[model samples]
Target: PQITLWKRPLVTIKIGGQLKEALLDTGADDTVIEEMSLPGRWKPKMIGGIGGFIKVRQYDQIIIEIAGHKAIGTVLVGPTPVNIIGRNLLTQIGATLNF
Candidate 1:
């Protein structure tokens, strides 16, 4: 028999407005805020990006806590399938991910 294992930091961020807690991922390249998980009061903007000027939106700086460390940063809102925590933040703290 064989066993598979996985590990991740218990760190998480609370979504503004809705106050939903979500896990943080260092492997992601961009901060992704899903439209559906966002609160009703969040009015995101359609901005430009690397994908030849895509409709990227902005959100209030989200507050997150990880391993007793805390941080706040602006989130890029989108109607993507899932929410993601990107390098836009991890780089600020010099983080490395391991499998």
Candidate 2:
């Protein structure tokens, strides 16, 4: 989908058969989702933000259905203001920002 700058790049993504809207941020290194109980084992990871850094749970090889496009990658679960679809998953989906 060719998105314009009128609004932030927001889209619906599915994980664990649940639907959620997230920002498609090319600047983000990884996808950071809100706090939720994810199945299986995950590693403790530290992610940074504008204000500071916070600890997060890194769940790898997770499959996500992003607007019908499927992506398998790592998803970080922790305290995030909002969900973000970062370049890690964005590149998998071939999402590019064009003028």
Candidate 3:
């Protein structure tokens, strides 16, 4: 689906069987989620963004539903202020940017 790139492209998605809102960020290489309980083993990794770097748990093989479009990929859990759906998952759902 075509998404408007306003201040932030927000969308509803289901992660780990929980429904949550996430921002569609094309600039982000990986999906980052706010701290949450997920059943899986993760490795400690640091990701850098506009602010700086943040410690996160990288969880692989995560299933998420974006507007009925199912996508499975890696999800980074950490102290992010908001959940973000990056290109990894965005491409799966065939999301296109419309200026």
Candidate 4:
């Protein structure tokens, strides 16, 4: 299967049994999600970006379904403006950026 990269590559994915839209960000090292209740143990951490830094809960080994591909990776839950699917999960889905 092939995925086309749009200016803002948005895709629907299932996380924690809930469906949500997320942005495909190659620039991000980890997947960041909007505040949601997920069953797991998490550690407090801070992430920095162009928009500054934010506090987040780092959950380990969460399952996400993207375009029928199920990937297990870390997901950060916090006050993110949008959900983002980063390289951590992208690699599992075999996603490539073709220009």
Candidate 5:
């Protein structure tokens, strides 16, 4: 038997120009920010699927910290039924998932 662990990275989002902690998720395909936490200046676009969709928008930039490392990039902000940290962030940092 092999033990598998999913180590989550710490994520922070810029809300009202301030950074706050966000839930990390390895199962998600893309990095997502809380729609409610996003700044008003961000434009929201319709996004959904068979599972149901919510409006998703792109931020000009966002900051995240993990493993004592930091990353800054344009993250997608949306109204997801759940929160996630996604592969977009992990792939850039060379993180690997093991089972």
Candidate 6:
């Protein structure tokens, strides 16, 4: 679907068969999601952004469904207020700012 800038650019995403809402952030290099239940091994890592740095759990090879388009990548589980799908996964799904 063609998304315009008039809105917040929020989209529906599915992780581990669970659905959730997330922002398609073109500016972010890594995908960050709110702390949630996810099976498998994850390591401790730090991610920095607008409000400085925060510790996050780095989960690898996680498959996330973006608007029905499935893509596999790493997801950082953090205490962020909102879930963000960054350029790493965005590039995989061919999301761009051609405007």
Judging by TM-score against the true structure, name the best candidate: 2
- lDDT per prediction? 0.55, 0.91, 0.87, 0.88, 0.60, 0.91
Q: Which ranges in model 1 have alpha carbons more than 4 Å from their true place?
A: 1-11, 17-23, 36-54, 60-62, 66-68, 92-94
TM-score for each model: 0.51, 0.95, 0.90, 0.91, 0.58, 0.94
List, residue by residue over 1-95, the lDDT tens digit for candidate 5.
12144543445544455556765566666766676554436655665555877778877556666443466655777677655666777676667
Error of 1 at 90 (Å): 1.9
* Models ranked on TM-score: 2, 6, 4, 3, 5, 1
lDDT, model 5, position 70? 62
The clash number for model 5 is 2
TM-score winner, 2 or 4: 2
After TM-score superposition, the amount by which residue 84's alpha carbon in candidate 4 deviates from its true location, in angstroms, is 0.3
Q: Of models 3 and 6, which has the larger TM-score?
A: 6
TM value for model 3: 0.90
Quote the positional error of residue 69 for candidate 1 in Å: 3.5
In the range 1-99, model 4's lDDT, one tens digit per residue, is: 565654568889998788899988889999999999888799999989987999999999988898678999899999999899989999999988775
Cα lDDT of model 2 by residue, 1-99, tens digit: 788878987899999889999998987999999988778899999989799988999999999988789999999999999899999999999987776
TM-score of 6: 0.94
Model 4 alpha-carbon miss at residue 32, Å: 0.2
Q: Which stretches of candidate 3 lie over 4 Å from their true place?
A: none
> Model 6, stretches more than 4 Å misplaced?
none
**Candidate with the larger lDDT of 1 and 2:** 2
